[PDB]
Paper text:
The mammalian SLC13 proteins are members of the larger divalent-anion sodium symporter (DASS) family. DASS proteins typically have a molecular weight of 45–65 kDa and form obligate homodimers. Each protomer consists of a scaffold and a transport domain. Structural information, along with cross-linking and computer modeling, indicates that DASS proteins operate in an elevator-type transport mechanism (Reyes et al., 2009; Drew and Boudker, 2016; Garaeva and Slotboom, 2020).
Numbering used by the authors:
A (entry chain A), B (entry chain B): 18 to 462
C (entry chain C), D (entry chain E): 1 to 228
E (entry chain D), F (entry chain F): 4 to 212
Write the structure that this text describes.
Amino acid sequence: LHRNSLIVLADVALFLALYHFLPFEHNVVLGISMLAFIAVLWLTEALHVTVTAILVPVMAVFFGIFETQAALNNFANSIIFLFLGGFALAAAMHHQGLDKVIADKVLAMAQGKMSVAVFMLFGVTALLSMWISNTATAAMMLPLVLGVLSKVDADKQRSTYVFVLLGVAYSASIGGIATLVGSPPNAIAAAEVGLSFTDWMKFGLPTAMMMLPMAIAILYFLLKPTLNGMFELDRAPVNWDKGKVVTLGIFGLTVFLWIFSSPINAALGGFKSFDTLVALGAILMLSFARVVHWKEIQKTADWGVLLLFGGGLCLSNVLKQTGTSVFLANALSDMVSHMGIFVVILVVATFVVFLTEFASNTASAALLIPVFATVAEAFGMSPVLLSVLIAVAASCAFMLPVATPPNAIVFASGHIKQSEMMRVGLYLNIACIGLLTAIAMLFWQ
Amino acid sequence: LHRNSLIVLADVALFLALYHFLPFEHNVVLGISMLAFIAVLWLTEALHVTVTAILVPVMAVFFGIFETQAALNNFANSIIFLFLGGFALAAAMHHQGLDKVIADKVLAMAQGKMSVAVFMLFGVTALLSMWISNTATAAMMLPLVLGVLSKVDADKQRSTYVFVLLGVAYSASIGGIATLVGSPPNAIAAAEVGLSFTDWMKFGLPTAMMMLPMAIAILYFLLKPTLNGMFELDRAPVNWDKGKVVTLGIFGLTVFLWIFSSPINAALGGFKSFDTLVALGAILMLSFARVVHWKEIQKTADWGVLLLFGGGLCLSNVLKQTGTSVFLANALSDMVSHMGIFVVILVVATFVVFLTEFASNTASAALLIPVFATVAEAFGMSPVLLSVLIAVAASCAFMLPVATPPNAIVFASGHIKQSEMMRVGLYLNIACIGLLTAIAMLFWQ
Amino acid sequence: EVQLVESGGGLVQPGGSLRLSCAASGFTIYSSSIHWVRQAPGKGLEWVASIYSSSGSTSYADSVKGRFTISADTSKNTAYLQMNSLRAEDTAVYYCARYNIHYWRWYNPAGQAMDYWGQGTLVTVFNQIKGGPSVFPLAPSSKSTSGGTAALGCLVKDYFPEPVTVSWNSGALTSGVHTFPAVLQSSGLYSLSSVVTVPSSSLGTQTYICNVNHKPSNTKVDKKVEPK
Amino acid sequence: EVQLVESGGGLVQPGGSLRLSCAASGFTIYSSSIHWVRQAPGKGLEWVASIYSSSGSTSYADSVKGRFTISADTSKNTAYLQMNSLRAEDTAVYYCARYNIHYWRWYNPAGQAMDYWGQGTLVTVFNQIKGGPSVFPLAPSSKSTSGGTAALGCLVKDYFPEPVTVSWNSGALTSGVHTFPAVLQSSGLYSLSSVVTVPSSSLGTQTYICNVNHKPSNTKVDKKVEPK
Amino acid sequence: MTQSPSSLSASVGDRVTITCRASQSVSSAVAWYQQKPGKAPKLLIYSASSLYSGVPSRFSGSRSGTDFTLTISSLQPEDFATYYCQQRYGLLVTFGQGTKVEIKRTVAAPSVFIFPPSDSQLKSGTASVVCLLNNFYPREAKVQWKVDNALQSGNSQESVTEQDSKDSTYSLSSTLTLSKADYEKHKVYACEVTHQGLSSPVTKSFNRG
Amino acid sequence: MTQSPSSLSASVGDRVTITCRASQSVSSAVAWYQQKPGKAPKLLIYSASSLYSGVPSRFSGSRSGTDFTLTISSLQPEDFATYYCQQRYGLLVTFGQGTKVEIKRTVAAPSVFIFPPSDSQLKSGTASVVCLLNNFYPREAKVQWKVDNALQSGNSQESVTEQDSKDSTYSLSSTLTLSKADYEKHKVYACEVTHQGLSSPVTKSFNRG
Ligand SMILES: CCCCCC(=O)OC[C@H](COP(=O)([O-])OCCN)OC(=O)CCCCC
Ligand SMILES: CCCCCC(=O)OC[C@H](COP(=O)([O-])OCCN)OC(=O)CCCCC
Ligand SMILES: CCCCCCCC
Ligand SMILES: CCCCCCCC
Ligand SMILES: CCCCCC
Ligand SMILES: CCCCCC
């Protein structure tokens, strides 16, 4: 009846037709059919992305690939709890009004000049999107932007609004690239290839600092704003109070343990996922310090994402067990033999960068990182590189409305068109493809 | 500074003093100290019960008992997902207005007589608390009760209000005893001793049907109400609509798979936790049928409980590994040798029944079920019996305000005193001790 | 895969001391209870001691408290039973079993009750030696069953440790033979009987001779049953 | 714990057929790739074939496509390499290794690259037999190094399969001996040399004789090096 | 704990039951063991009734309070062994007094003989008078060592075989161990034997030379 | 894939390096193997540089693009073996052409001798003229089988030992396999030998009888 319902039923027909008409070994065809089914469900978002995550195990058990608990244990990978600690910290420095005070304390340094305050906004947004979230910080910042731009006109010099808002949302989606926490695809990659915090920052932070100024430049040049002006913000200013400095101490200590986590771990006894134990310790420090209450951490966190991590991991483990990934790798051996590596990562980056515009970031990553990480384990390639690339590119959703929520938050206001976003995001996605390809080809060496 | 903070710091001092001054084997003393720490934290509720659950693994890794993931995998036991499916069904038949319509369709059968409508309310409340929750259904029903009792006086014949409301809350806390879903302690027990749905209903449903009429009787006799009257309910009546019958079909089918889960499983291929796969299938049927959207399932479910299950399971696994449970069993061998079984379950039931009045049900269960299940595995006793008994008695929180939320929901209104609840709950807790002891001593044979 | 091998069992004197070891494989002592079970000489099973090493919690039987001591060092796998003040009423075949308790909820080769014992270490509390298995013919009464069968035997007298083998005419007569189990005499010296059934007529055409094989003292004797 | 045992390797004729088996223990073929690696006769390592059974995905080398065929039945553990149309340039020592790929994220004895190979099955594509290791003395030139050392040897001519042992004077001279590796003649018959270094003066006081031990045809010959 | 019955006479194909009373009504840890002579016990049932992996379905268990119980539906020829109940309570165990199931047959007529001591007994200073009971049914033969209407308690030893494999009967070789002059100062020697197959206790007396 | 250098002359305690060029810039699956003569290869490094459990720390690896590389810091006497690189690409593997590290020493003076064929060669119809090179340094001796200023290509076989264990030198036993009349119709027989230790190629000629 409904559209998505027809999508699902066509998906089931496709899966049955594959399962029956694909002449292979049973496990190859089973994994192929599950992959097609899950993919069509994770791109079209017929069923909530997390419902499909849940459905992955149910089809990994009902066909004998796994024992129930061996599948359900995918939903407890230490990266899930690292992201839960990230959500706890976000809730602490939101409920306790830390992010807002940070923003106001930055803007005030730009005494009254918008020309520097907008770049302050971009820096702040990409400095908070690391930890807090991509949607939440964009929603928090849009009011600040409008307060910055209540002076200027909305129809005459509208390019200024487009610049400010797009830069904000772009900066959120980018700053999400700078920490495991910050965007789910980071964690999907890390869990699929076993990465730490500071063993992922090495790929994230340089990329974010090399891609954010790029995007700001391309906005400033495709759009010719009138950023000269004065700055009148109307809200009761904020100030440091006990409970915020405590939260800052806890947050800084947690980040410190996260960064220097190998030297500390070795000096403690060598535990496997010490960043996750740092995250849990952050939860406990916060709760024992009373800055946050678990009700906030449960109202804020997105447990759908935390079930998605497990669903994608189970799909990875399915493509592993069934040897589907190896079947493909053997099927694509000649093409990838002729194609080097530069072309491989170029194709991957192009595909995901122009995909996540139409699909979601988290779902697209959960779908592809398993596929390509396994197919790369088969080929010998390092799954770390491809997983990181697909987690960094899936964030690049700069082209149109809901591809990331931030774009849609901005394009709720109505001061930006669609065509301008399409053009800007096209140029930006090309440049980001170039940048990802270059910094990857570097990290290879 | 704060009270709970002093509780925690005294707890840490106690744990250190044990760890250092208890001369035993290192693992015995470690498990003893962790048990004391966790207990003081789960009774006093200094830290949110779930924060302590999270803290259990962190102290099971930082002292070498377990590898990080071997601990975190406790938070993925199939019972957790069974309860997640229960929460999904609750959200479906709440968002879709199924519970409310059920209630209104029952009350209408009692044309206009309160004398039968109050017992209809008790039956309905214990019929919904099986699936939905204990707090939520009491909150939903309190307005219905007041609508029943808007005719009668609140100060002259107040015993009627006390009867109606206490029976409602008692019925919620009881009906929670009739299904794995319905109350967490059910699941804590099941996970700790590996129980199915219909292999726990055998202990739950008869107990609930033998304890609910008991409680209603003791209320009707300790209080001499004036239940004679007429019935005027003022709200736009409800009726069946598509989306509710679909939800009923899904719910009935899910319950059917849950009950006949062994015959079906054998006829499907024999999978380990087929009730949990039924739960997940219920989520998928609902989402593909569009009666609920995962946003509801995430706003409704109490993931704190789902982390608590894992925390309690990890505590059980700690008391297992360290052999602490066996150390105790050997230490208590003589006393339990003299004491039979009747006395053992009598003491256990008395202790928990009079404990959960002061502490919480879920925390008390999570604390004791591990302890006593392991100590019973040591003694040879069946952990099934003791775990079920502590999960059925912890629900018996009939004595005073917050011991279960329902009591406090009722005693928010102000038409019932405290002393009346204390007296009624004392008599009821004694009678429930008797009943639990009898039906246990039966299930033993 | 899983197995327990028991060692350290052998000869002892009263007021003495021995020490049995029970080396394990296929599981970890850390996650199970070890159980030391002396059966008896020619009687039923008797339990002796137990240990759970994760805690160091040991339980001895009421009959062996200030006389035994169980122990266990993990990191290879073991469960030692040090026997002290061994009495005459302690000679037996000690077995070493494993009992899993907790079911562990994740995975283990753990079994659940004494599934995997071993083979047995025989300890023989001992007083006196220099008993070679003396041999002692038994004469069928001259008035033996007429037209029927008459059984005759050779008695093995005053011998020490098991085993002693008594075969008649070097395997020539394995029909109607009966080699009774050994009995412990009041003086600590074992002594059994070995008998054969035969017709009363064919007695004179053959010589019936029993080979007393005894390795400990390396004895081989053969007695000629010659009725007068 | 883990090991791979390779069997089925032996004598063959050209245009023939053989079938090697590689039975595994300590892991599951289902979760790893099996790799068949013929080294060479007296050369370096060469890769031949591979299989991943979970998918049935096989990869042969460019040199063996319509000639080999790999296979594997799980449920005990195996990886069969059926060799067909064996050529003269295929005699070698086939090894069978395991390569784990995916790291599995939970647990496995899986290794990661060819950690655990085996011992080797030698296959010798073969043309003609009835070569017993003929023996052939080498005379030190009558003008041998004056006041120095002169080496002399016995040549093992026209023999078949390895090994052939050549010790001089039944172990009396293990100093200055050199038993060269066998070389394959143009006719398919092996032939090596075995030489000894000795002073030119002590040559006449001893007879130098080499024992040609050959089990296949059960030969033992001893040639007397007698310079004229 | 205490296990009954002591001895069971059961023919093949029969259904047999064993009871074990605990006297500690806390531990449902009762397990049942099958031991063949001299070999290590083999587990059948572990908690009270739930079967073990590698055991036939005819071995069932039950609890029924503290009266734990074992049931063998079809008694096969390989199920003739000694059966024990163990009860774990904490860390300490205790088995049952022992149950023995034996393949039954008709009454047999004990071939009872009496022997004197060989002359080489009469140099070391002892006499071993052998009273044999061959090919007789289950166990009950109190060999009354009767002389001059004088019984000698304590110095009467008894040794029996297990159940034979061809006729499933027992053979008994008692022994009166006596001193030197004690053998010389008495002439008559008889062993009276009581059995279900002998309506009259038969005594095989004899004189020295 | 292609592995260099072919042969390495390295003395104990030295640091040695090996290079392996892939030509398929996709797979970082390169692993390094240590083989002793006749024995099964022993793994050292698996992906490109990360060490294996049971291997010394002196075996390090590197990628540097497609120029994978192996490094042995302190060359110990037990590290003298044959080293191979394998590159997995999908399911198919390919090893390197082979690298051999040999413990080096000073130039040795090849003790070069020439032998005739024994008279029992001269009945079956063949002659095996043996040109021996004993106790000489590493490998380079192209034994020119020179007669009457006539070379016979193809019919010149060569067999060398491995590196000796007492003096770490090589010994070579070439062989001219010739026909019967071919042996009879020539009188002179010499093998010219070239080495770093001989400034002049020495020929050991001889005549039959
Ligand atoms: C994404 C929508 C899927 C559309 C259907 C599809 O992909 O076609 C089937 C393929 C492979 O099966 P085949 O067509 O090669 O069999 C043909 C042989 N006759 O399945 C896959 O490989 C899907 C992998 C997608 C992961 C991104
Ligand atoms: C619940 C509050 C705990 C109060 C402290 C406490 O229980 O005392 C320590 C005990 C046992 O240690 P011990 O006192 O026997 O050492 C004395 C020996 N000298 O620890 C336990 O057994 C705690 C178990 C509680 C589980 C419900
Ligand atoms: C506030 C985040 C700081 C991150 C610093 C990272 C430098 C390696
Ligand atoms: C609506 C719940 C029905 C439960 C029936 C249980 C009967 C065994
Ligand atoms: C065509 C893309 C192949 C992917 C290589 C991992
Ligand atoms: C005193 C209570 C002991 C608990 C038995 C499990």
